[PDB]
Amino acid sequence: PIIQPFMASRRFTSTLGAGTGTGAAFAIAATACLNDAGTTATAFPTFTYYNLYVNGILQPSVNSSVTTGPTGAITIPGGDALDGGIPITIEFIVT
Amino acid sequence: PIIQPFMASRRFTSTLGAGTGTGAAFAIAATACLNDAGTTATAFPTFTYYNLYVNGILQPSVNSSVTTGPTGAITIPGGDALDGGIPITIEFIVT
Amino acid sequence: PIIQPFMASRRFTSTLGAGTGTGAAFAIAATACLNDAGTTATAFPTFTYYNLYVNGILQPSVNSSVTTGPTGAITIPGGDALDGGIPITIEFIVT
Amino acid sequence: PIIQPFMASRRFTSTLGAGTGTGAAFAIAATACLNDAGTTATAFPTFTYYNLYVNGILQPSVNSSVTTGPTGAITIPGGDALDGGIPITIEFIVT
Amino acid sequence: PIIQPFMASRRFTSTLGAGTGTGAAFAIAATACLNDAGTTATAFPTFTYYNLYVNGILQPSVNSSVTTGPTGAITIPGGDALDGGIPITIEFIVT
Amino acid sequence: PIIQPFMASRRFTSTLGAGTGTGAAFAIAATACLNDAGTTATAFPTFTYYNLYVNGILQPSVNSSVTTGPTGAITIPGGDALDGGIPITIEFIVT
To answer: Does F95 contact E35 at a Cβ distance shorter than 8 Å?
Structure first.
């Protein structure tokens, strides 16, 4: 068949109630984020650009900071003041 | 399961007899308002829009002014002339 | 800051004594309903779902019919037989 | 047209005189609650948060417990001592 | 001019009330989904990865299954229990 | 290291209350849209395909028209009738 460029989306789901610290250190660990399969994930994969969805709203690139690897953690500052039931959807575009 | 948008209602109950000052400074402190659990609350949470129920009647947005934080206090002007047994129900829609 | 979903409540207050016609044509005009500011409003805004409060009691969705626009009018059938001093509180949830 | 978020309110009306048991088992069955159409309903639908209106007064979240499904029943403890003519208005916000 | 890689997004809009069957067979036909033009579409086009938006919330890759061709149908299990007015937005990234 | 294809997402945030004109001329200027940094932007960059998010809902390609350059403006018809507080999120995929 005709070869086409490879592109894939990896989506991790969690809640704002599974964070650590307060202030600019509020981070959701990669070991507390369910991936696109329905199980507890292990590591955030490498990406080119990522999208953060707080309660279904696409957030800008200044309100989040994500690190890959087994010890990865998405740094969402200001999330401590928000409620603990707000869903989080982190989408990685691996190309 | 299917992820759904998060929405929650926080209801605080008090009476008009637990206010301070007279005139437009009549305010019910957040430390004298029982939340939806049956205990003395501590701070009014962040919201998007709030509803005030004076004796079960939904009041407009011009007869009340609510502030969040530990030092929060709902400013209900004109409540001094009313009776001290009138129930107050403050509903916060946290989305 | 973190972007949050937008939601707002528009409340219009009037009385059953400012209606027109009898039977199923009893309607309260949008030009005779005070909005949440304390002045005579002009038009019922667009909404997703609306709540009607007759004397502080939440009515079902079968006892009222509301139309938007400058010529809007909430159609409350059977209100002619009721007293003319019954307050009306119409709440629109604009999301 | 512009797509907007979907939100709907389902209101069920009954009286405190149609309950079963005494104490903390006082429950109003879903088959004895008239929905927002004016007929006998069948099942309480799924929701995100619900509001209970006893005689037009918004009750907190600790004085009621609602279950969905065909065998649903709102558990209102302490309602046996109250009168049998007190109206009940259960509002479900399905988002 | 400078040649750039080609990428396009195809968005189909429908509601959960236009599904067939119950359980894991709940599927929205491609002939009942309005495409990004405002008309009734005919076939789901070929893609590399697809995103499903239930009520504006990005769903994971385990709660949906989409097939292309004229007889295509997005298989969304568990949608029968949900309301019939929930919007559906299916985005195909054709690269 | 291994060279990978370049892809980037540019997100601009504004509100429906910062538009000009009525009807099909309702446009949000590029000088009144905050980019993904938190400051007032200057020009919409070149893209391949763009996504419009009205109140967190992904809109089709027929309800918007975006122009690049310093004088760029996203043409969203029908937004005049909507509320002025509805957030707008414009995502450009520059590949």
So the answer is: no
